[PDB]
Subunit: 140 residues, 2 copies
């Protein structure tokens, strides 16, 4: 638990959590590509492996509960804590991250990617708003 704070192992858990999260997403993408190809056994293999990566990421997050949410630095655990962290993250995404990435895409000559980032800014704003209403009505 707490002796983790400020260690290299803390940073390794965060890195491994990021890698495992991405591995799940990547393997599900690969599974859908296998679906389209009619490669049903390969698809099923990707999905089974992706499920293993979910368990791995879950374990990393269990350990990180001692130090804070890797996306925000905020405590996590209870639903009130979780909503507060998700709100903070989402708010940062819609106010700064995606609009900044949109502007840069546009200025580099990637109009469609800029429009995509703007679509995502709108999406995260809707997430942040829904989470806030949920927290506002929470009875714990």
């Amino acid at each position: 638990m707490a002796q983790l704070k400020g260690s290299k192992t803390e940073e390794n858990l965060k890195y491994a959590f990021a890698g495992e999260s991405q591995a799940n997403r990547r393997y599900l993408y690969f599974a859908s590509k296998a679906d389209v190809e009619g490669q049903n056994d390969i698809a099923a293999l990707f999905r089974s492996t992706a499920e293993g990566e979910t368990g791995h990421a879950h374990g990393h997050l269990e350990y990180l509960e001692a130090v804070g949410d890797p996306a925000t630095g905020l405590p996590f655990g209870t639903s009130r804590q979780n909503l507060q962290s998700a709100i903070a993250g989402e708010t940062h995404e819609y106010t700064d991250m995606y609009p900044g990435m949109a502007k840069t895409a546009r200025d580099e000559g990637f109009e469609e990617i800029a429009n995509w980032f703007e679509t995502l800014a709108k999406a995260e704003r809707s997430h942040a708003n829904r989470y806030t209403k949920a927290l506002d009505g929470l009875v714990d």
Copy 2:
């Protein structure tokens, strides 16, 4: 304008990492809600997680033009995807997880060291299954 070597390429990789993590985080939060009996909050975290799956999917579609953010290798076809997955998993079981276990043991986190060692063994097994699948792929 070429995506390869652009600031936008790097931003798509970063955004992909963020979106991937957001889905894992929100699913974890959904399980905490389930245990507390906050079933409406659980459903909101799951719904939101599904949105983040879409976002990650779209970032990956753009990154197909440049390479797999985990390995730098091409992806698209099952042959390419297996090859990339094998390369990533091999890095994790030979280098990443053993390095992390050594640091954890050195810092006195013995349980965590063993966790990373267990994961190294799991990724080796992943690599081996993907290699078998690639070997018999009808392509």
